[PDB]
Amino acid sequence: LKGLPVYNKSNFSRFRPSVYLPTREYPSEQIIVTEKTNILLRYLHQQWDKKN
Amino acid sequence: HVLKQLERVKISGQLSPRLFRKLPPRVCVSLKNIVDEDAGHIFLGFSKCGRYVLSYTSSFYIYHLYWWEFNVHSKLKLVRQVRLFQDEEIYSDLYLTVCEWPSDASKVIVFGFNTENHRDIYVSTVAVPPPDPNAQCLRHGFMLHTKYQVVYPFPTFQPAFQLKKDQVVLLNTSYSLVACAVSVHSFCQILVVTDLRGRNLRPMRQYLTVEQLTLDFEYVINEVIRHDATWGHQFCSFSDYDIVILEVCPETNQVLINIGLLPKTYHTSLKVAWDLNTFETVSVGDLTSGSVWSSYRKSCVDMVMKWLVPESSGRYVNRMTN
Amino acid sequence: SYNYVVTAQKPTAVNGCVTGHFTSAEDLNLLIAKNTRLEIYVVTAEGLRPVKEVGMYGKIAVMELFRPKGESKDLLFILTAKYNACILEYKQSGESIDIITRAHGNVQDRIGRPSETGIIGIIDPECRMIGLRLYDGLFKVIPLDRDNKELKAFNIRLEELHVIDVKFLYGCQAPTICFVYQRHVKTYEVSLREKEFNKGPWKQENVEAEASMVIAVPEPFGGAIIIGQESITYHNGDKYLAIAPPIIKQSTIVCHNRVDPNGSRYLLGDMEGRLFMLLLEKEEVTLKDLRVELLGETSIAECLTYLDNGVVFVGSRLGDSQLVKLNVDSNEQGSYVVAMETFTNLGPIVDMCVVDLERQGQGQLVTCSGAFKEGSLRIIRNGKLHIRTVPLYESPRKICYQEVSQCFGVLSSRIEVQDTSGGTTALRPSASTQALSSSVSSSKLVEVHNLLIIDQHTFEVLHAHQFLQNEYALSLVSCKLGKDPNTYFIVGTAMVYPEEAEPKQGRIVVFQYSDGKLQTVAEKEVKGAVYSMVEFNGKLLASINSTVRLYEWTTEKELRTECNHYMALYLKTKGDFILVGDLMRSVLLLAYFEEIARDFNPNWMSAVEILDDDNFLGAENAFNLFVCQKDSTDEERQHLQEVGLFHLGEFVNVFCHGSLVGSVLFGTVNGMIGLVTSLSESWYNLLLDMQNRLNKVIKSVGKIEHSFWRSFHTERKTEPATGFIDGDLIESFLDISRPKMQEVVANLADDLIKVVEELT
Numbered sequence A: 001l002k003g004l005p006v007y008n009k010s011n012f013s014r015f016r017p018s019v020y021l022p023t024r025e026y027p028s029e030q031i032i033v034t035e036k037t038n039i040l041l042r043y044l045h046q047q048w049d050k051k052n
Numbered sequence B: 001h002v003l004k005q006l007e008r009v010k011i012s013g014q015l016s017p018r019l020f021r022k023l024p025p026r027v028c029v030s031l032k033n034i035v036d037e038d039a040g041h042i043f044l045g046f047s048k049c050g051r052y053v054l055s056y057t058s059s060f061y062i063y064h065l066y067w068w069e070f071n072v073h074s075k076l077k078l079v080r081q082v083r084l085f086q087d088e089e090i091y092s093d094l095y096l097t098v099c100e101w102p103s104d105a106s107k108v109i110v111f112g113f114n115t116e117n118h119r120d121i122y123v124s125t126v127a128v129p130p131p132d133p134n135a136q137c138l139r140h141g142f143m144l145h146t147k148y149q150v151v152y153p154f155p156t157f158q159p160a161f162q163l164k165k166d167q168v169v170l171l172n173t174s175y176s177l178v179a180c181a182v183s184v185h186s187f188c189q190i191l192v193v194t195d196l197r198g199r200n201l202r203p204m205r206q207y208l209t210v211e212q213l214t215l216d217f218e219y220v221i222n223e224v225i226r227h228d229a230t231w232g233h234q235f236c237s238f239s240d241y242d243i244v245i246l247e248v249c250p251e252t253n254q255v256l257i258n259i260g261l262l263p264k265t266y267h268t269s270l271k272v273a274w275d276l277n278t279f280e281t282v283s284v285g286d287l288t289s290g291s292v293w294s295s296y297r298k299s300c301v302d303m304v305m306k307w308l309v310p311e312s313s314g315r316y317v318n319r320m321t322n
Numbered sequence C: 001s002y003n004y005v006v007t008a009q010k011p012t013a014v015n016g017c018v019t020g021h022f023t024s025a026e027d028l029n030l031l032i033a034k035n036t037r038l039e040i041y042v043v044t045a046e047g048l049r050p051v052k053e054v055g056m057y058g059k060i061a062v063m064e065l066f067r068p069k070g071e072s073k074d075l076l077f078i079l080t081a082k083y084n085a086c087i088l089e090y091k092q093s094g095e096s097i098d099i100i101t102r103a104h105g106n107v108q109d110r111i112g113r114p115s116e117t118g119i120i121g122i123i124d125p126e127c128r129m130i131g132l133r134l135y136d137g138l139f140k141v142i143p144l145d146r147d148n149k150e151l152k153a154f155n156i157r158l159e160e161l162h163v164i165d166v167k168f169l170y171g172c173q174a175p176t177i178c179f180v181y182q183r184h185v186k187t188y189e190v191s192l193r194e195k196e197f198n199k200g201p202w203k204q205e206n207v208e209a210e211a212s213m214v215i216a217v218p219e220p221f222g223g224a225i226i227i228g229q230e231s232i233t234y235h236n237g238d239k240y241l242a243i244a245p246p247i248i249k250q251s252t253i254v255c256h257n258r259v260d261p262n263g264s265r266y267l268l269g270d271m272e273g274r275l276f277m278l279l280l281e282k283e284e285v286t287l288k289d290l291r292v293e294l295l296g297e298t299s300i301a302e303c304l305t306y307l308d309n310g311v312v313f314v315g316s317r318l319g320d321s322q323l324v325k326l327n328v329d330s331n332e333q334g335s336y337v338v339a340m341e342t343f344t345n346l347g348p349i350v351d352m353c354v355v356d357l358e359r360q361g362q363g364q365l366v367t368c369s370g371a372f373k374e375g376s377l378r379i380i381r382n383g384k385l386h387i388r389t390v391p392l393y394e395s396p397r398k399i400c401y402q403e404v405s406q407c408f409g410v411l412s413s414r415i416e417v418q419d420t421s422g423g424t425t426a427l428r429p430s431a432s433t434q435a436l437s438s439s440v441s442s443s444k445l446v447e448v449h450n451l452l453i454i455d456q457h458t459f460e461v462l463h464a465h466q467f468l469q470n471e472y473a474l475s476l477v478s479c480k481l482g483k484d485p486n487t488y489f490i491v492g493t494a495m496v497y498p499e500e501a502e503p504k505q506g507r508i509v510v511f512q513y514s515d516g517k518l519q520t521v522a523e524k525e526v527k528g529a530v531y532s533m534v535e536f537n538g539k540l541l542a543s544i545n546s547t548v549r550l551y552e553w554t555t556e557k558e559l560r561t562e563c564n565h566y567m568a569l570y571l572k573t574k575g576d577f578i579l580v581g582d583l584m585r586s587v588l589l590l591a592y593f594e595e596i597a598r599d600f601n602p603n604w605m606s607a608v609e610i611l612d613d614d615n616f617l618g619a620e621n622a623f624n625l626f627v628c629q630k631d632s633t634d635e636e637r638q639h640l641q642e643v644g645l646f647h648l649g650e651f652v653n654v655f656c657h658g659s660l661v662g663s664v665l666f667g668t669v670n671g672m673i674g675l676v677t678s679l680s681e682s683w684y685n686l687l688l689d690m691q692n693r694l695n696k697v698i699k700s701v702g703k704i705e706h707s708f709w710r711s712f713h714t715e716r717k718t719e720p721a722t723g724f725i726d727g728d729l730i731e732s733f734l735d736i737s738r739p740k741m742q743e744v745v746a747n748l749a750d751d752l753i754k755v756v757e758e759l760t
């Protein structure tokens, strides 16, 4: 028991962060968009597709 | 039990009415003789904001509505007074029913229903007092009395859906369903006899515009039977229909309405979607007298229950019927 | 009303903690989450060398570091309590450090009711999709494709409508979820293309009612472990395992961490502070039996995070966060855990009374903090902000200062467990039993409530006063009532009984510290509980339930009531005016009683404060700040118009008048300490234009609009922020470079520098 794992033995052997204010702008790769169609609407239309 | 709950709030920092709902209402007043003419004034229920106690006169009849201020322990103070259905002669007792929009709290809508084949239904919207008059805020106070009737297969009241959309009220007459939008101030419901009043006088229709959108049921059913029914090529005749609103989405302005249409007519249940934005798309068809109506309505309520999505508390449509 | 809010002390409570490789694949990282505060720490040989603390414009409620295939390092997904989700990618190109926001968007649906249990965010172990519990009976799902410019999140109806918590299972060929609904456990597989809840891997099963946590066991073990009181159950189809060790019964398990990558070793944290090592026996690749092992106790844990070299970061919210080291050997007291470094945290600020103990007008803030075993008084003075901590090992309610005897009276509560051996023994030897002198009320007139008088120099408990059994001490204040010049310790208790939900009996007890001995000068029994008290021109103003009665101190050494009024909780007094903050009736005014004006708009205020004679402020339960004025109109004057609105983002518990260096100090459960200061109209206009232009030139991490972040938000209505200046934004202005100052000033340097300098 206590055979704990170690990612790297060096860490924790010799024993507050600056605020990051962004000035430059890097364009966003992707945008989250939420589907607005109501859940009944989507389900009934999908079943309509199946029998069509 | 309450004290340790407040202690939990002090530490957790999370306090919601839902977990303060188990506690009984601390204040409970008899309201005996406190309300004027304790008879002359029948209160329905507490308003959504709670600062008002709606009450109407028992009484042709006048049905004077009177809003009352609500204090923790004091006499209630009448703050508003209107006769609701003014341009409406009355010869029956109506079970008054008033509701408010989920978030458009500026005005409330009251529906009076009574006990043959035709039933009298009266609807009117009144602006709640904003918290010569020479006060523009009071000038907002408006009145929109409206009156119609329905055939023996009386449509389901379904008050919440009928008002799910803000600024708009859906009325399902026996032969059409109307989407009245009493907007006071660019345009909505685009991409019925509604006499208006206010301050006991009738102005021309700060300005308020009622955007009315209707579908004639018979026409849309003819369209659907012509274009979207596999057994519609052999359809002979339809006599009567019941329209039930399954659900109203205000985000996309769609209302899902069901029709239980009836060499003989056979029971069906045909689904319809109406885009209030602008335009009728058939969602789902169906397949093959009061009893079948009741069974159909039972099916609709089963569907609504089976797809119930609890609206966020505060975005509900309070129904107020004593 | 034109007010300026700035944060004197950044919040220190640990909301969340995730271990991964954000900065660089090779460097292990432990991201710490604090309300609107993201701290990145790289674990090194010396310790956790801090990297960067970027400030989110939202309450970080969901934080997961995930690695999509093809990304060199793990990307970061943050979802603020204002329902803003974002994807962050660390980029230390050369010296420049930039957190590029790969994805940004709101996910609020404004349809379903916020879930009763906290918001819940899962990520598919194969990084296919993101699962997000937002409202009852709904399940927001986000695809993780890289190609599409717009990710199309959608919802699927969860049928249970009351789900405790969900987790994504491991090894399933399709993304299957496993949760517990109010209780049973059910699993529905999820189809991304079809957008529906297909049948899950295994059938639903019944579980103990207290089951409140699912842990996704990784492969090769597979399955999921449901955690509940006397209910340690493992679910994996045919492999249904269960265990009920008596050690679990002591308290509900609240935290879980994967010590072993294979999942053999898992860490458990409970409210009592105990730390249980959960073991999965490795049979040939199946599980034979579950077992748990207690390793000792630690500070109350909000989130555990195992680090390399067998060390763990006990993220805390009710107290002080610790770096506990797990020793393979047992300690002499049978504690496999040894503390090494303890990160300071003000935690829940239940109360605070600014006092200038020294001279030189340097107000020193003494604050009751922590709870349960970690309750402690905090002393913070400007430098930077040196913080001296005096542990009490019991929950403190509120503190009042009596400069006459140079003492600090604090209302303390300690938890004791009933037994048939004697009356009841205490859990731990706290300060209540460690006081120099001890006495009890024992006046005719489980939790043990005591009054601990403490010195203002040595900070050592001088005397304790354990109240009656079931006597719930609620309120305390010190003042010289009436003509009698001896300062008294007037406190309010509640005779709460388990049978009765709402209290019916309570006693206003007058006390006086006689050279080391607390004397009960008077004990007036009051119908109902005494929720809050305050002095009023030499007369005590009590608050019995909804009633608000003033009391007079007669020469006969007794309390006599004056008048009544008609659940009052918050009493602040200025001049003749009494501000009453009810729980649902919001703000009310009084005078000497006659009602003056009430804010009718319902708000669950957490604290109130009278800035000026006409500027009344309070904070509701929506972590938002509003100031209402009294317009001076025969009856419209009885209406309070909310002049200014603001979304602070923290649950302020108390409002104290003063300043460390008008000024109002406020304390939050997260441990934030902030300054509310009034402004002049011209200066307010200049600052608002300042902030508007600064927003344009300063970028926002996660592309979160500052106007939206600070805009008023509650369950009913949302309005833009008015009458309030963010302050912190303006502080950022001085930090930016002079060329960017040239841009922000635009059409209209040193004068703005000076104004922000004095604002500092």
Ligand SMILES: Cc1cc(S(=O)(=O)Nc2ccc(Cl)c3c(Cl)c[nH]c23)oc1C(=O)N(C)C
Pocket: B156, B157, B158, B159, B160, B161, B162, B244, B297, B300, B301, B304, B305, B308
């Ligand atoms: C979930 C819910 C919503 C509403 S509603 O306010 O829109 N009313 C309402 C809706 C639909 C129908 Cl078909 C009817 C009929 Cl028939 C009478 N009222 C109706 O009521 C419920 C509800 O609890 N039940 C129906 C049982």
